[PDB]
Every structure is written in structure tokens, then in C-alpha cells.
Amino acid sequence: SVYDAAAQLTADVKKDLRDSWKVIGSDKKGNGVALVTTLFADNQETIGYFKRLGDVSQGMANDKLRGHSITIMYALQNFIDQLDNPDDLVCVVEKFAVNHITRKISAAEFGKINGPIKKVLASKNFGDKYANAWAKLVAVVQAAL
Amino acid sequence: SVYDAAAQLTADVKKDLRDSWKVIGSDKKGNGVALVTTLFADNQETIGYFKRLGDVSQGMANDKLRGHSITIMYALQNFIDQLDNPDDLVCVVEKFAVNHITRKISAAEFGKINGPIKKVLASKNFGDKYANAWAKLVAVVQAAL
Ligand code: HEM
Ligand code: HEM
């Protein structure tokens, strides 16, 4: 299932993922917070899963939110690093899904992260071509949920 | 407290962490699996916390074990990347501790990783000076548990 989704990660898709990550991943705190705060702004209902973070309206200034935002970027770093080995990509993706499954986050719910990613990419001038590539990586994770 | 523990990361300690991570972090899969397999070998009592992983003695061949091993290395990468800013290091450590606190992992239990780290460093010709530097970073996490 996850292997089949990983199959959509073609040579060109992986190339665009790596090229865009070279920029997005160069500021994990800034872009990580941008992703998270954008998710909450565009889909307020997702805040229901983050009661532990406290006052999320504080954004970057909220230590817990900042800690979470920086940390999510290392999961993405992990994924990008394993792109050339399907066997490793699949095992770290299934490992990553464990806690999200326990939190009862469905594939559909997880997919809401696509909008924020598209917006963050656009802020760095990466068009639809790149957004589509990232949607395919997100789809690999969705296959594990 | 974690804030006092973070202040123990002096200039030279941070430098030694970076110099050793440059090598250790070069092969996250290899060193990650080595680190975890060594933990189970020197402290069989910790295996109980990893029932989900299955037969841990299979090592690299165990997909779940390999997935976990690679993933733990990105947490260390996160810590090293935050050494420049104490405020960020602290919020990232507290974030990291959440799930370990839920699993009932004590500071004493977590500290068992020092042995494996010392042995992996030694395998790459990094002596006691580096093992002690890493023990200080581990102490920051211990203060949060
Ligand atoms: C590209 C997207 C995402 C990445 C890379 C990501 C990454 C992570 C990472 C690494 C953690 C810490 C480890 C863990 O507890 O599993 C985490 C925690 C969590 N994630 Fe995900 N996640 C993403 C999207 C989502 C979405 C869309 C939701 C919910 C709608 C979600 C909800 C959570 C929650 C509630 C936690 C715990 C937060 C806390 O209490 O600190 N994640 N995620
Ligand atoms: C260098 C030290 C360590 C690092 C960097 C590390 C890193 C991580 C990371 C990143 C995760 C995945 C996210 C999460 O679920 O929290 C995790 C999971 C876990 N950790 Fe830690 N950890 C370390 C040591 C330990 C130790 C010493 C124990 C137990 C004695 C422990 C027990 C666990 C368990 C049981 C899981 C879940 C495994 C699974 O079911 O996949 N960790 N750890």
C-alpha cells in the first residue's frame, strides 16, 4: 500500500522535492511555524488536536508551538533523505504514522496540510509544479494512515 | 531544571558536539541501528518498552527497528541544530520529552543511552572528551523527564 504510493515518486518528482527542500529546509523554524500557523488559519478545526500547545494565536512567540513547528521539519528532512531507497522511505513513513494513527488523524485530515505547503512554497516562488510534487509525498504518508 | 541544564552547554562542549556529529551524523542509518542495538545488548531490560518493534535481534533486517533507528537520529540532528539558541534548544527538548514522559521513561532510564553513545563514538575514534560532551546534552533531556 505505502510501497505503491511511493511508486508515484518518479525521478522528476524526487528532483523537484529535493530542489525545493534545499530552500524550504534552510529555515526550519521560520518555515515550520509558517506551515503550522497557516494550517490553523485555513482550517481552524485542526486546532482541536493541539490543546496541549496552549494559546496558538501567539504563533512563533509560543514556546510549545515553536518547539512543535521546528520538530515537524525534521520528519520532512527524514523523508527527503530517504527518497532514493524505497525500502527505507517506507519504514520511516510507517514509523511516523504510528503516533498519528493513535491520535486518530485520518488520511483525509492529514491531507489538509497540502494547502499550507502550497502557500509556503509559493512564498519562496515555487509554483504548482512543486506543490504537486509535495502532494505526492504527502500521499505516501496518507497511504499509511 | 531544563533551563539550568541547557546553560551547562559551554562553548567547547558545543564545539565537540558539532565536530563529532559531523562524522556520526554522516551515516544515520548505520550509526542509528548501532546505537539502538547496543542499547538492547547492554541493557536487555529496556527491550520491554519496544514490544511493538518485534524481534529486535534481527537488527537491520527488522523493518520496524530500522525505521525507529533512522528516526532517532533526526532528533539528535534537531538538538545539534539548536545549539546556537538556548531558547529554541529548550522548547525542542521539552517537545521531545512529551512522548517519553507518556511512556514512563525516567531520567535514569533515558541515561542508559550514554553507554551506547560512548561506544559508537569510540568506534569512530572519538574518546572520553566527546562522550562526556554528549552526556551533557543527554542531561538536558534528562532534566525534562
Ligand atoms: C507534513 C505534515 C506533518 C508533519 C511532517 C508532522 C510531524 C510531526 C512530528 C515529527 C511530531 C512529533 C512526534 C509525534 O508525536 O508523532 C508530530 C506531532 C503531532 N502531530 Fe503531526 N505532522 C504533520 C501534520 C499533522 C497534522 C495535519 C495533524 C493534525 C491535523 C498533526 C497532529 C499532530 C499532533 C496533535 C501532534 C502532537 C503535538 C503535541 O502535543 O506536541 N500532524 N507531528
Ligand atoms: C539518544 C536518545 C534517544 C533519542 C534521540 C530518541 C528518539 C526518539 C524518537 C525521535 C522517537 C519517535 C517519536 C516519539 O514517538 O516520541 C522515539 C520513540 C520511542 N522512544 Fe525514544 N529516543 C532515545 C532514547 C530512548 C530510550 C533510552 C528509551 C527507552 C529506555 C526510549 C523509548 C522510546 C520508545 C518506546 C519509543 C517508541 C518506539 C516505537 O514504538 O516505534 N527512547 N524516541
Swiss-Prot record, chains A, B:
CDD domains in the record: Mb-like
Extent of the signal sequence: none
Superkingdom classification of source: Eukaryota
UniProt keyword annotation of Transport present: yes
One cellular-component annotation, GO: cytoplasm
UniProt-annotated location(s): Cytoplasm
Main location: cytoplasm
Molecular function per GO: heme binding; identical protein binding; metal ion binding; oxygen binding; oxygen carrier activity
Keywords, ordered alphabetically: Cytoplasm, Heme, Iron, Metal-binding, Oxygen transport, Transport
Keyword Transcription regulation: no
Globin domain mapped to chain residues: 8-145
Binding site for heme b: H100
Listed Pfam families: Globin
PANTHER family: BLR2807 PROTEIN, GEO09476P1
Family to which this protein belongs: Belongs to the globin family.
Description of how the protein assembles with itself and partners: Homodimer.
Protein's name in the database: Globin-1
Species of provenance: Anadara inaequivalvis
